[PDB]
Write an enzyme that holds these catalytic residues in place. Structure first.
Site, PDB file in Angstrom:
ATOM      1  N   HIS A  24       0.823  -1.220   0.000  1.00 29.81           N
ATOM      2  CA  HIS A  24       0.000   0.000   0.000  1.00 29.81           C
ATOM      3  C   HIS A  24       0.859   1.275   0.000  1.00 29.81           C
ATOM      4  CE1 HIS A  24      -3.300  -2.839   1.387  1.00 29.81           C
ATOM      5  NE2 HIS A  24      -3.879  -2.199   0.385  1.00 29.81           N
ATOM      6  N   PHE A  67       2.587   4.566  -2.916  1.00 32.00           N
ATOM      7  CA  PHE A  67       2.234   5.470  -4.005  1.00 32.00           C
ATOM      8  C   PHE A  67       2.055   4.747  -5.347  1.00 32.00           C
ATOM      9  CE2 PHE A  67       3.227   8.564  -7.392  1.00 32.00           C
ATOM     10  CZ  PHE A  67       2.115   9.362  -7.215  1.00 32.00           C
ATOM     11  N   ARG A  68       2.825   3.688  -5.563  1.00 31.73           N
ATOM     12  CA  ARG A  68       2.725   2.954  -6.806  1.00 31.73           C
ATOM     13  C   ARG A  68       1.372   2.256  -6.907  1.00 31.73           C
ATOM     14  NH1 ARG A  68       6.694   2.313 -10.394  1.00 31.73           N
ATOM     15  NH2 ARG A  68       8.205   2.977  -8.806  1.00 31.73           N
ATOM     16  N   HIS A  69       0.857   1.723  -5.789  1.00 34.66           N
ATOM     17  CA  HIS A  69      -0.508   1.149  -5.733  1.00 34.66           C
ATOM     18  C   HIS A  69      -1.520   2.238  -6.024  1.00 34.66           C
ATOM     19  CE1 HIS A  69      -4.101  -1.021  -4.370  1.00 34.66           C
ATOM     20  NE2 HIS A  69      -4.333  -0.074  -3.474  1.00 34.66           N
ATOM     21  N   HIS A 126      -7.349   7.104  -2.207  1.00 31.66           N
ATOM     22  CA  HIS A 126      -8.096   6.083  -1.472  1.00 31.66           C
ATOM     23  C   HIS A 126      -7.340   5.333  -0.386  1.00 31.66           C
ATOM     24  CE1 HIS A 126      -6.307   2.790  -3.769  1.00 31.66           C
ATOM     25  NE2 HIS A 126      -6.920   1.961  -2.939  1.00 31.66           N
ATOM     26  N   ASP A 127      -6.009   5.329  -0.412  1.00 31.37           N
ATOM     27  CA  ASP A 127      -5.216   4.657   0.626  1.00 31.37           C
ATOM     28  C   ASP A 127      -4.199   5.598   1.283  1.00 31.37           C
ATOM     29  OD1 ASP A 127      -6.175   1.989   0.997  1.00 31.37           O
ATOM     30  OD2 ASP A 127      -5.327   1.407  -0.960  1.00 31.37           O
ATOM     31  N   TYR A 130       1.428  -8.476   4.248  1.00 32.12           N
ATOM     32  CA  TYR A 130       0.655  -9.393   5.082  1.00 32.12           C
ATOM     33  C   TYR A 130       1.534 -10.218   6.048  1.00 32.12           C
ATOM     34  CZ  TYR A 130      -3.844  -8.815   2.430  1.00 32.12           C
ATOM     35  OH  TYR A 130      -5.018  -8.343   1.870  1.00 32.12           O
ATOM     36  N   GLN A 189      -3.749 -16.206  -4.717  1.00 27.28           N
ATOM     37  CA  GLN A 189      -4.410 -15.668  -5.897  1.00 27.28           C
ATOM     38  C   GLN A 189      -5.580 -16.474  -6.451  1.00 27.28           C
ATOM     39  OE1 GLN A 189      -3.238 -12.933  -5.122  1.00 27.28           O
ATOM     40  NE2 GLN A 189      -2.573 -12.091  -7.108  1.00 27.28           N
TER      41      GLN A 189
END
Ligand SMILES: C[C@@H](Nc1nc2c(cnn2C2CCCC2)c(=O)[nH]1)C(=O)N1CC[C@H](F)C1
Ligand SMILES: C[C@@H](Nc1nc2c(cnn2C2CCCC2)c(=O)[nH]1)C(=O)N1CC[C@H](F)C1
Ligand SMILES: [Mg+2]
Ligand SMILES: [Mg+2]
Ligand SMILES: [Zn+2]
Ligand SMILES: [Zn+2]
EC number: 3.1.4.35
Lengths: 322, 322
Positions: B68, B70-72, B108-109, B240, B269
């Site tokens: 989470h 800046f690239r996300h 948003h994050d 995580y 995934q």
């Protein structure tokens, strides 16, 4: 003089209790009696001393606003206490539910600033920006409630296991958030639907009942004796004028009911008694018939008095205008 | 680097864009170009110098967490940009709605700490106590976004009237709060309910479509080409594992899907693709049939590719067994 007479403790159990008679320490002691008297100290191993420090914590974090002050919090908690007895709520609710009802009542306006939601949002305050225009004061009240409870010396729940803390916390949050009058119609329409076939073994019906009880107590000043009730209207309007002053001299919208030129003591209550208080206690009376004679009764007497006061106010305005 | 080539401007309009090639410098200039190109700078009288300073401040308020970051942030807004063109959103949505979609996606994050809501609530963090266990991270993202916008040198909405600002604030808030994955089923079911007979002039139907749209972009990494998508799985698990390890040493609950003993890259995934991503994009495909070929197709291949890689994993485990 803290230390209450046996006469006081008797009076404390009824909604006729003169809330104005007492100074803070006496009210703290009154609240301390309530926790002991309902068995909450016994059933949740609350340290008797921690209970007193907690009530002192809480008291410190209420503000010297004209209306949203510690005395309001005592009114709402004492009225919840009265409602436990009047309705015999220890027959229908667990001791956890009583603890939620009482602790939520005490904590539900912690650190109120004296300006309501609509000010917070329109002025784009610290609190409106923090809580995204979603019941900002009410969230703030819970936040402060549990910030107090996170201090070990103020933590009345210190000997409740984690699962019970989790359930109380959820409960307290639901109720404190329910006090936002923005939601009165939504909460009442939810409740009245559940009321079509009420069920005390339905957790969702009961969550709503508790929401309605804290709401009942929150706005309960006019249920009390005329002598006890009437001075809260000055306290309200004084607080309301404080905001509408600010709103005018900042160029923000002003609510008609906070407008010096429009509102009177009488017109503040006629509408509120008739279309908020009466219908709420009417619905609640279905579930508890004894509510009618004790609570709904002084509301009719208040409605009738404030409509007379308007006739005299209005008659007196026919002399003024040029 | 900055000063983007005409080629970069064209590739930026599609989900195939190699998000990994660009340093913070260039991703900002890209986001900037998006605002000019979509006619948001034009139609909202946005000061282009303010646009640059806002974006620097936004970027400054994202943290260097594995996932989470800046690239996300860039991926989600870039995927939103792609969808605008792919789904011809400017033929269905107002410019105000596009402004809400892009600005929400970017914001948003904001200031995400790298531990999710379940951590916040079980560790009783400032955030959880502040936000009353209610989507604490998402509320905080919104809070940080509008703290930034309250600074006049970062304020891209400075020349919008108040009515418009209120509408954007409200819209962005709905969207950012919709990204909490705990509400995925609720939101999808609400969307599917309207989808039985959808209506673009129904404002509530649209509000959900915008909630679904930002949700799509938020979790869209597997939609991108397999070279671009795959290193994001490592970034995810790194974050995580960082949380599950802390949860272990602090004595808090640990989530199986985050456990570094239990979870593979493939198990992380497969379920997620087959049962979150695919059904969501399946429902969007009904409204925008062109989505199937461009987004559902790479998801199908990624599912197949990861299902095959689990069969490899599982046969290597059977050789291990003594
Ligand atoms: C003039 C105002 N009158 C009014 N408001 C009250 C009382 C108690 N609490 N409150 C508010 C609401 C909760 C906090 C303070 C009360 O005895 N009278 C009114 O009609 N309204 C209606 C809208 C708003 F609730 C105030
Ligand atoms: C291992 C995890 N897999 C997973 N999570 C993702 C992706 C993108 N975003 N995210 C989360 C969504 C919010 C935070 C980042 C992705 O490609 N795969 C999973 O199965 N789950 C189950 C639900 C939970 F959201 C994650
Ligand atoms: Mg209040
Ligand atoms: Mg997030
Ligand atoms: Zn109150
Ligand atoms: Zn995200």
């Amino acid at each position: 003089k803290y230390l209450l007479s046996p006469e006081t403790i008797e009076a404390l159990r009824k909604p006729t209790f003169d809330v104005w008679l007492w100074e803070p320490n006496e009210m703290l002691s009154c609240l301390e009696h309530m926790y002991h008297d309902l068995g909450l100290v016994r059933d949740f191993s609350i340290n008797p001393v921690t209970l007193r420090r907690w009530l002192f914590c809480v008291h410190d974090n209420y503000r010297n606003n004209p209306f949203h002050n510690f005395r309001h919090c005592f009114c709402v908690a004492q009225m919840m206490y009265s409602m436990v007895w009047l309705c015999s709520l220890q027959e229908k609710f667990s001791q956890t539910d009583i603890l939620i009802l009482m602790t939520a009542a005490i904590c539900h306006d912690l650190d109120h600033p004296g300006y309501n939601n609509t000010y917070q949002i329109n002025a784009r305050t610290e609190l409106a920006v923090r809580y995204n225009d979603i019941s900002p004061l009410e969230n703030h009240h819970c936040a402060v409630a549990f910030q107090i409870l996170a201090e070990p010396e103020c933590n009345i729940f210190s000997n409740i296991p984690p699962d019970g803390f989790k359930q109380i916390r959820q409960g307290m949050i639901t109720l404190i958030l329910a006090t936002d009058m923005a939601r009165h119609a939504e909460i009442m329409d939810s409740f009245k639907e559940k009321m079509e076939n009420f069920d005390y073994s339905n957790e969702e019906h009961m969550t709503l009942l508790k929401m309605i009880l804290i709401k009942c107590c929150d706005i309960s000043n006019e249920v009390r004796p005329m002598e006890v009730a009437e001075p809260w209207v000055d306290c309200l309007l004084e607080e309301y004028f404080m905001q509408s002053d600010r709103e005018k001299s900042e160029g923000l919208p002003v609510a008609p009911f906070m407008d010096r030129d429009k509102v009177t003591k009488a017109t503040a209550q006629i509408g509120f008694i008739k279309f908020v208080l009466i219908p709420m206690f009417e619905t609640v009376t279905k579930l508890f018939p004894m509510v009618e004679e004790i609570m709904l009764q002084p509301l009719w007497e208040s409605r009738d008095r404030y409509e007379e006061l308007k006739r005299i106010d209005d008659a007196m305005k026919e002399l003024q205008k040029k």
